[PDB]
């Protein structure tokens, strides 16, 4: 197949794709938007 | 009235002699007779060398792996030397001259019959390595413009950075890491072999933490 | 048997649907009020030992 | 189906571990109970084997703990008895 | 190359937050595990297949009782991604001789000593 | 065209024969080596 290093982003195994989709960064969400409160 | 602030003074920065970029030769003075394999690992993962400023305050930072060859070297050196100010800015290399020999077989050749003759030389570069550094009694905006110009023409992703810019990026990366709100981390799962994920992952992923894919680096990956 | 009753005992099936709707409303009220007090009447599962 | 059954602690599959499965299907019309069903007999045998294994494992763990405690006590007593053999006279006077 | 994976021991060190999340008491831990296979050994390495065979979890969703001792714990750590581990709790005492016949595992892990079929 | 030839030797199967704690009889080879290790 391909080498471990390539020029075309080398689409991943579906398990790895699910892992990356599940381990994404989630920013914190304040209870009330900062602009609304005084 | 508009309030005014003191200008950042430059009384503690001295430009060195020969402020322009040194010529870079395509091939080493002593050519390598023995041909080496394509150890593609020298562009994989984060850079362990030339990651921090030494004398200047601005630089070109690589955000991905790749090979620099003589055309790239000439492009960056010519653009920098024709776009900088010798009396107030100095530029210094941070990548060695091309030393890795790339061999190619003759055109229209079938597979087999030994390796090919050495054709040219390249400089491997990893993500996170400074390629050219800049210093002097100048602000960042002009150098940022005409250095992003050069960085857009590199074989990999690149940016124009400063000391404060790079420090800010690193602190924001740490802040994102600590305030990440989901409880499932690539590092945790990979190191604990959760779900048996090591059958899909790589032995390098334990240290790459999911932030590196081949010669590509994801700065938003956490 | 649910389809059997739906075809041949429509009264019984209407009673079953009414009971399911009552339980659904009780579940909504429970999700609103955490019980407090009666946690519903067609709730209160029967325990076995 | 039922996952709420698990929250009630009731065998998410309603076809095991409950009266609907373990009660006799039928009995004679005059009142005499029916012979036990084959699935119920097999489930009873498996349950007995599981309980006996639980008892055996617990007893083996307790015996191992007691043996370790006894070994530690015996070693301590033997070393303490080794301690007291002193008849010093070289630096007595 | 794909190899066996050794897990750092810092993974198997619970925090007070974990002791609050789950009902386990770090003092007087549970004697016995209930282990249940919930994932096939197909597309898994032969050593994991063998470990499942040794642990006796060849049949999926069938509970098996094991000791809470380091040897079997390492055995379970090898295949921890294919199984479910719960503590075995005894509401009453251990099964006696005259109550050994009428028992039930009674999921949530409570091995009940008396098993009637009547409502409370 | 493949100027290199010759390097086709098999492994010598050299190393430790009896490891630490192994019971050994007189004359048994413990380890076969070159370039003392
Ligand atoms: Mg050889
Ligand atoms: Mg050979
Ligand atoms: Zn607002």
Swiss-Prot record, chain A:
TM helices/strands, residue ranges: none
**Subcellular compartments:** Mitochondrion
Q: Which domain of life is it from?
A: Eukaryota
- Give coiled-coil spans as residue ranges: none
Q: Which family does it belong to?
A: Belongs to the universal ribosomal protein uL10 family.
Whom does it interact with, and what assembly results?
Component of the mitochondrial large ribosomal subunit (mt-LSU). Mature mammalian 55S mitochondrial ribosomes consist of a small (28S) and a large (39S) subunit. The 28S small subunit contains a 12S ribosomal RNA (12S mt-rRNA) and 30 different proteins. The 39S large subunit contains a 16S rRNA (16S mt-rRNA), a copy of mitochondrial valine transfer RNA (mt-tRNA(Val)), which plays an integral structural role, and 52 different proteins. uL10m contributes a single cysteine residue to a zinc-binding site with mL66.
Protein name (Swiss-Prot/TrEMBL): Large ribosomal subunit protein uL10m
Show which stretch of the intact protein is covered: 29 to 66 of 261
Curated annotation (Swiss-Prot), chain B:
- Coiled-coil zones: none
What broad class describes the main subcellular location of this protein? mitochondrion
Q: Would I find Ribonucleoprotein among this entry's keywords? A: yes
GO biological process assignments: mitochondrial translation
Compartments in which it is found: Mitochondrion
| Database matches in SUPFAM superfamilies | Ribosomal protein L16p/L10e (SSF54686)
- Record-linked InterPro entries: Ribosomal_uL16, Ribosomal_uL16_bact-type, Ribosomal_uL16_dom, Ribosomal_uL16_sf
Keywords of the record, alphabetical order, are: Mitochondrion, Ribonucleoprotein, Ribosomal protein, Transit peptide
Per the record, what is one GO cellular component? Answer: mitochondrion
Question: What is a GO molecular function of this protein?
Answer: structural constituent of ribosome
Subunit architecture: Component of the mitochondrial large ribosomal subunit (mt-LSU). Mature mammalian 55S mitochondrial ribosomes consist of a small (28S) and a large (39S) subunit. The 28S small subunit contains a 12S ribosomal RNA (12S mt-rRNA) and 30 different proteins. The 39S large subunit contains a 16S rRNA (16S mt-rRNA), a copy of mitochondrial valine transfer RNA (mt-tRNA(Val)), which plays an integral structural role, and 52 different proteins.
The family classification in the record reads: Belongs to the universal ribosomal protein uL16 family.
Protein's name according to its UniProt entry: Large ribosomal subunit protein uL16m
Gene assigned in the entry: MRPL16
UniProtKB/Swiss-Prot annotation, chain C:
Single Gene Ontology BP annotation: mitochondrial translation
- Species source reads Homo sapiens
What is the protein's name according to its record? Answer: Large ribosomal subunit protein bL20m
Instruction: Give the gene symbol.
Output: MRPL20
Give the UniProt subcellular location, in the record's own words: Mitochondrion
UniProt similarity note: Belongs to the bacterial ribosomal protein bL20 family.
One GO cellular component term noted in the UniProt record for this chain: mitochondrial ribosome
Describe the protein's quaternary organization and the partners it interacts with. Answer: Component of the mitochondrial large ribosomal subunit (mt-LSU). Mature mammalian 55S mitochondrial ribosomes consist of a small (28S) and a large (39S) subunit. The 28S small subunit contains a 12S ribosomal RNA (12S mt-rRNA) and 30 different proteins. The 39S large subunit contains a 16S rRNA (16S mt-rRNA), a copy of mitochondrial valine transfer RNA (mt-tRNA(Val)), which plays an integral structural role, and 52 different proteins. Interacts with OXA1L.
UniProt KW keywords: Mitochondrion, Ribonucleoprotein, Ribosomal protein, Transit peptide
- One example GO MF annotation: structural constituent of ribosome
Q: Where is it mainly found?
A: mitochondrion
Curated annotation (Swiss-Prot), chain F:
Instruction: State the signal peptide span.
Output: none
Cellular compartments annotated: Mitochondrion
Domain of life, source organism: Eukaryota
Could you say which protein family the record assigns here? Belongs to the bacterial ribosomal protein bL27 family.
Q: How does it assemble?
A: Component of the mitochondrial large ribosomal subunit (mt-LSU). Mature mammalian 55S mitochondrial ribosomes consist of a small (28S) and a large (39S) subunit. The 28S small subunit contains a 12S ribosomal RNA (12S mt-rRNA) and 30 different proteins. The 39S large subunit contains a 16S rRNA (16S mt-rRNA), a copy of mitochondrial valine transfer RNA (mt-tRNA(Val)), which plays an integral structural role, and 52 different proteins.
The name this protein goes by in its record: Large ribosomal subunit protein bL27m
The source organism is Homo sapiens (Human)
Q: Gene encoding it?
A: MRPL27
Q: Which residues of the full protein are shown?
A: 38 to 74 of 148
């Amino acid at each position: 197949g391909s080498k471990a290093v390539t020029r075309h982003r080398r689409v991943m195994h579906f398990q790895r794709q699910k892992l990356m989709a599940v381990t994404e960064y989630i920013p914190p969400k304040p209870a009330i938007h900062p602009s609304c409160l005084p | 009235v508009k309030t005014l602030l003191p200008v950042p003074s430059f009384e503690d920065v001295s430009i060195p002699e020969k402020p322009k970029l040194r010529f870079i030769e395509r091939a080493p003075l002593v050519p390598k007779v023995r041909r080496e394999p394509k150890n593609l690992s020298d562009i994989r993962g984060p850079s362990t060398e030339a990651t921090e400023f030494t004398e200047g305050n601005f630089a070109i930072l690589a955000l991905g792996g790749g090979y620099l060859h003589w055309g790239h070297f000439e492009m960056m050196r010519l653009t920098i030397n024709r776009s900088m100010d010798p009396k107030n800015m100095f530029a210094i290399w941070r990548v060695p001259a091309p030393f890795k020999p790339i061999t190619r077989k003759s055109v229209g050749h079938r597979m087999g019959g030994g390796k090919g003759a050495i054709d040219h030389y390249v400089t491997p570069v990893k993500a996170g390595r400074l390629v050219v550094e800049m210093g002097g009694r100048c602000e960042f905006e002009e150098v940022q413009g005409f250095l992003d110009q050069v960085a857009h023409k590199l074989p990999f992703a690149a940016k124009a950075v400063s000391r404060g810019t790079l420090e800010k990026m690193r602190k924001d990366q740490e802040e994102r890491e600590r305030n990440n709100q989901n409880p499932w981390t690539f590092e945790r799962i990979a190191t604990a072999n959760m779900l048996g994920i090591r059958k899909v992952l790589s032995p390098y992923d334990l240290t790459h933490k999911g932030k590196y894919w081949g010669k590509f680096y994801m700065p938003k990956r956490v | 048997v649910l389809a059997d009753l739906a075809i041949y005992e429509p009264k019984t099936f209407k009673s079953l649907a009414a009971l399911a709707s009552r339980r659904r409303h009780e579940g909504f009220a429970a999700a609103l009020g955490d019980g407090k007090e009666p946690e519903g009447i067609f709730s209160r599962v029967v325990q076995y030992h | 189906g039922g996952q709420w059954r698990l929250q009630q602690g009731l065998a998410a599959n309603p076809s095991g571990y409950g009266p609907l499965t373990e009660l006799p299907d039928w009995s004679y019309a005059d009142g005499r109970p029916a012979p036990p069903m084959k699935g119920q007999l097999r489930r009873k045998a498996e349950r007995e084997t599981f309980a006996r294994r639980v008892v055996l494992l617990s007893q083996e763990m307790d015996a191992g703990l007691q043996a370790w405690q006894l070994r530690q006590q015996k070693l301590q007593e033997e070393q303490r008895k080794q301690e007291n053999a002193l008849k010093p006279k070289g630096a007595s006077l | 190359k794909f190899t066996r994976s050794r897990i750092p021991e810092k993974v198997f060190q619970a925090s007070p937050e974990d002791h609050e999340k789950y009902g386990g008491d770090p003092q007087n831990p549970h004697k016995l595990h209930i282990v249940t296979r919930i994932k096939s050994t197909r597309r898994r390495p032969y050593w994991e297949k063998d470990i499942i065979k040794m642990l006796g979890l060849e049949k999926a969703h069938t509970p098996q009782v094991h000791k809470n001792i380091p040897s079997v714990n390492a055995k379970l750590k090898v295949v921890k991604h294919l199984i479910r581990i719960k503590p075995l709790k005894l509401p009453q005492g251990l099964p006696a001789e005259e109550n050994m016949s009428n028992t039930c595992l009674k999921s949530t892990g409570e091995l009940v000593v008396q098993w009637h079929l009547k409502p409370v | 065209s493949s100027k290199n030839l010759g390097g086709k030797s098999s492994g010598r199967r050299q190393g430790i024969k009896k490891m630490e704690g192994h019971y050994v009889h007189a004359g048994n080879i413990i380890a076969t080596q070159r370039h003392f290790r």
